[PDB]
Design an enzyme around this catalytic site. Structure first.
Site, PDB file in Angstrom:
ATOM      1  CG  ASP A   1      42.871  69.789  -4.080  1.00 13.77           C
ATOM      2  OD1 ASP A   1      43.179  68.912  -3.240  1.00 13.77           O
ATOM      3  OD2 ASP A   1      41.760  69.801  -4.684  1.00 13.77           O
TER       4      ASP A   1
ATOM      5  CG  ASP B   1      43.685  65.569  -3.533  1.00 19.91           C
ATOM      6  OD1 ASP B   1      43.006  65.762  -4.560  1.00 19.91           O
ATOM      7  OD2 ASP B   1      43.285  64.821  -2.616  1.00 19.91           O
TER       8      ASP B   1
END
Ligand SMILES: *[C@@H]1O[C@H](CO)[C@@H](O)[C@H](O)[C@H]1NC(C)=O
Ligand SMILES: *[C@@H]1O[C@H](CO)[C@@H](O)[C@H](O)[C@H]1NC(C)=O
Ligand SMILES: *[C@@H]1O[C@H](CO)[C@@H](O)[C@H](O)[C@H]1NC(C)=O
Ligand SMILES: *[C@@H]1O[C@H](CO)[C@@H](O)[C@H](O)[C@H]1NC(C)=O
Ligand SMILES: *[C@@H]1O[C@H](CO)[C@@H](O)[C@H](O)[C@H]1NC(C)=O
Ligand SMILES: *[C@@H]1O[C@H](CO)[C@@H](O)[C@H](O)[C@H]1NC(C)=O
Ligand SMILES: *[C@@H]1O[C@H](CO)[C@@H](O)[C@H](O)[C@H]1NC(C)=O
Ligand SMILES: *[C@@H]1O[C@H](CO)[C@@H](O)[C@H](O)[C@H]1NC(C)=O
Length: 536
Positions: free
Chosen positions: A330, A349
Site C-alpha cells: 500500500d 495495492d
C-alpha cells in the site's frame, strides 16, 4: 572504469563502489543491486562535464525466488536514478547493447539522440520531477490486459537541493552517524538525530531500525543506501525522515512479522513489517517525510501504532516508492490534516488511502500494478470530510480481473464480513471530496467501483482523462455503485450530490447520454441515478 560524480552548487550525483549487477539472487549484505542495462550521466546546461549517476535496480522477489509466488508473476524489473539539481540539466541515458516515451506524457521534455545515447533536457523546478523513460523496443504485453509496458523500467528522480530543514547542518548537535555495515544500538541511543552518510548499511532480515524515544530525526544522505525499515519510538511533537538516500526492504521476506522472528506472518494477521512506523502518546505529532526513496517494501508501507490516530498528521514531499512487486504494498497513510505532494508510487495495492479528514494530496505519479484501486475509501465505514486529491497521473495499470478490485476511484466491501451489501453504517458520512485532474495513461480500469458503506455527500470528479480502456473481456472497466443498507437497522445508505465533470475517454467527453456506452458507467444503482450528475 571509475565513476566521476558531481558535487557542486548546480548538481550532485553519486555512486556506490559495492554495486552488484545481479538479476536473480540476493546481493551481498554490503552490496547495492545495480542496473546492468542502463547507464545514466548528468550535465548542467549549457552543454560545455557529464557526471555518472548510480542506477539502482529492484527485482520481483528481491532475488528470493521462493517469494515470487507472492508477486503478480511478471518478469518486469524496475531501475531508477536520483540526483539533486538547482539548474536545468541534461540526462544522458545509454544502454548496454530505439525512441523513448516519457511518462507522465504531459512533461514534454525535449529529447534528442545520437549514435548510442538518449538525451533528455530536464528543466529545473523547485519541486523536482519523477518520471519514467520507456524504450519502444523494451515494451512487452502484460497478460491478460495486454498493457504495453517496459520489461525493464528506468525511473528518473530529479530533486532540488536539501535545505537545513531536510539536511542536518554540519556540526549538528546530539547526532549519531553509524559506520557502513550492520547498524546496531539505535534503539537504545540517546542521540536525537541519526545521520546516514554515503555508504551501505543493513539491518538483516531479522531486525529493523527501531529508533529510541529520543530520536526525532533520521537522515538518509544522497548516496546512502540503507537496508531496513523504520520504527520511531519517540512520542515527540515531530518525527522526521528526510534526505535523498534509499531505505530498502529487500532483506525481508514478504509479510515479515517482527513479532514472530521476522518470519512470514501466520495467517494474515496484518502485522507485516511497515517501512515507516511511529508511536503516539496522548499529544500531537507530525511525521515529516521528505526526499527519501523507499524500495521493496515487504508489506503495507506505513502505519502508526496506538488507537488515537487523530493525534498524527503527515507532511510528505519529494518521496518515492519503487520496486514494490509484492502484494499488499500500500501507499502511505494520510492521517488528519496531512499535506502530501510531489510523490512517486509504485504499488500493487491501495494507492491513495482516503481514510482521514482534512487531507490534501497533489502532484502524484502512480505506477499501479495489478491489485486494488488507485484511490481507496472502502473496507470500513468512516466519517471523512474535506479532501482534495489533485493532479494525479496514473502512468500505468495492469489489472487482470474483477477480483483485483480495480478502478481509479474505489471503495471495496466491508473488511469484517468480506447478504452482500447490508453491512453499512447509515450514521456515518463521507463529505466534501474533490478528485481533480487525474490522468490515466495507456489502458485503464473503470472510472469508479464504489460500495457506499456509509453515506456519500458532495463528491466531485473534475477533469479525469482515460486514454483507453482495458479489454471488456477481463471485467475491470465497467463502473458501478450498488445500493447499500445499514448493518443494524436496515436503513438505506444515501449518495447525494455526486458530480462528474471533464471526464474524457480518448478525445470524447462523457455526458449523461454516452456515460454507459463510451465511459462504461453502466452500474449506477437506480436508487442513486438521481444523485449522479454529469456536468459535461
Ligand atoms: C558533497 O559535498 C558535501 C559538502 O559540501 C558533503 O557533505 C557530501 O557528503 C558530499 N556528497 C557526496 C555524494 O559526495
Ligand atoms: C517477459 O515476459 C513477457 C510477457 O509479458 C514476454 O513477452 C517476454 O519475452 C519475457 N522476457 C523474457 C522471458 O526474457
Ligand atoms: C535493541 O535492538 C537489539 C537488536 O538490534 C535487540 O537485540 C535488543 O534487545 C534491543 N534492546 C532493547 C532494550 O529493546
Ligand atoms: C476537519 O476539519 C473540520 C473543519 O474544517 C472539523 O470540523 C473536523 O473536526 C476535522 N476533522 C478531523 C478528523 O480533524
Ligand atoms: C471542503 O474541501 C476543501 C478542500 O478541497 C476545503 O478547502 C474546504 O474548507 C472544505 N469545506 C469546508 C466547508 O470545510
Ligand atoms: C445507527 O444509529 C442507530 C440509532 O440512531 C442505531 O440503531 C444503529 O445501530 C446505528 N448503526 C450502526 C451500523 O451502528
Ligand atoms: C479542468 O481543466 C480545464 C481545462 O484545462 C481547466 O480550465 C480547469 O481549471 C480544470 N478544472 C479544475 C478544477 O482544475
Ligand atoms: C465476467 O463477468 C461475468 C459476470 O459475472 C462472468 O459471466 C464472466 O465469466 C466473467 N469473466 C470473464 C469474462 O472472464
Amino acid at each position: 572504469f571509475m565513476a566521476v560524480t558531481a558535487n557542486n552548487s548546480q548538481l550532485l550525483t553519486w555512486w556506490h563502489n559495492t554495486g552488484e549487477i545481479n538479476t536473480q539472487t540476493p546481493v551481498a549484505d554490503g552490496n547495492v543491486r545495480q542496473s546492468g542495462l542502463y547507464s545514466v550521466k548528468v550535465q548542467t546546461t549549457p552543454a560545455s562535464l557529464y557526471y555518472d549517476s548510480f542506477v539502482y535496480l529492484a527485482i520481483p522477489g528481491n532475488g528470493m525466488s521462493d517469494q515470487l509466488q507472492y508477486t503478480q508473476g511478471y518478469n518486469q524489473t524496475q531501475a531508477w536514478t536520483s540526483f539533486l539539481y538547482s539548474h536545468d540539466a541534461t540526462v544522458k541515458i545509454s544502454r548496454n547493447g530505439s525512441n523513448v516515451v516519457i511518462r507522465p506524457t504531459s512533461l514534454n521534455f525535449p529529447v534528442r539522440y545520437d549514435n548510442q545515447s538518449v538525451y533528455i533536457t530536464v528543466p529545473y523546478s523547485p519541486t523536482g520531477y519523477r518520471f519514467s523513460v520507456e524504450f519502444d523496443d523494451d515494451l512487452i504485453s502484460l497478460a491478460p490486459s495486454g498493457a504495453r509496458q517496459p520489461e525493464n523500467a528506468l525511473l528518473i528522480f530529479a530533486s532540488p537541493f536539501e535545505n537545513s530543514s531536510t539536511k542536518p547542518q554540519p556540526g549538528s548537535p546530539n547526532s549519531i552517524a553509524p559506520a557502513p555495515g550492520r547498524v546496531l544500538g539505535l534503539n537504545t541511543t540517546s542521540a536525537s538525530t541519526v545521520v546516514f552518510n554515503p555508504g551501505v548499511y543493513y539491518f538483516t532480515g531479522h531486525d529493523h531500525m527501531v529508533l529510541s524515544s529520543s530520536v526525532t530525526w533520521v537522515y538518509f544522505a544522497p548516496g546512502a543506501y540503507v537496508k531496513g525499515a523504520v520504527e520511531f519510538l519517540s512520542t515527540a511533537s515531530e518525527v522526521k525522515a528526510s534526505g535523498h538516500g534509499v531505505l530498502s526492504g529487500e532483506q525481508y521476506v514478504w509479510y515479515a512479522d517482527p513479532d514472530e522472528g521476522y518470519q512470514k506472518a501466520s495467517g494474515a494477521n496484518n502485522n507485516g513489517l511497515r517501512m515507516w512506523r511511529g508511536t503516539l502518546g496522548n499529544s500531537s505529532q507530525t511525521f515529516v517525510l521528505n526526499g527519501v526513496t523507499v524500495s521493496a517494501p515487504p508489506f503495507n508501507s506505513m502505519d502508526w501504532s496506538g488507537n488515537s490516530l487523530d493525534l498524527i498528521t503527515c507532511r510528505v514531499d519529494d518521496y518515492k516508492q519503487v520496486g514494490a512487486f509484492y502484494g499488499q504494498t500500500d501507499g502511505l497513510e494520510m492521517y488528519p490534516g496531512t499535506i502530501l505532494q510531489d510523490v512517486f508510487y509504485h504499488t500493487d495495492d491501495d494507492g491513495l488511502k482516503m481514510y482521514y479528514s482534512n487531507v490534501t494530496a497533489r502532484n502524484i505519479v502512480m505506477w499501479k500494478e495489478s491489485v486494488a484501486p488507485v484511490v481507496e475509501f472502502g473496507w470500513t465505514p468512516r466519517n471523512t470530510e474535506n479532501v482534495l486529491f489533485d493532479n494525479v497521473d496514473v502512468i500505468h495499470q495492469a489489472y487482470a480481473n474483477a477480483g483485483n478490485n480495480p478502478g481509479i476511484f474505489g471503495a471495496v466491501n466491508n473488511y469484517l464480513y468480506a447478504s452482500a451489501h447490508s453491512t453499512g453504517n447509515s450514521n456515518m458520512t463521507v463529505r466534501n471530496i474533490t478528485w481533480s485532474n487525474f490522468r490515466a495513461e495507456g489502458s485503464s480500469s473503470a472510472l469508479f467501483r464504489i460500495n457506499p458503506i456509509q453515506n456519500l455527500d458532495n463528491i466531485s470528479i473534475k477533469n479525469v482523462s482515460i486514454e483507453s480502456f482495458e479489454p471488456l473481456s477481463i471485467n475491470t472497466t465497467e463502473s458501478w455503485m450498488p445500493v447499500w443498507y445499514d448493518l443494524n437497522n436496515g436503513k438505506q445508505i444515501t449518495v447525494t450530490d455526486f458530480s462528474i465533470e471533464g471526464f474524457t475517454v480518448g478525445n470524447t467527453t462523457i455526458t449523461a447520454s454516452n456515460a454507459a456506452s463510451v465511459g462504461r458507467i453502466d452500474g449506477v444503482d437506480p436508487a442513486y441515478a438521481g444523485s449522479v450528475h454529469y456536468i459535461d
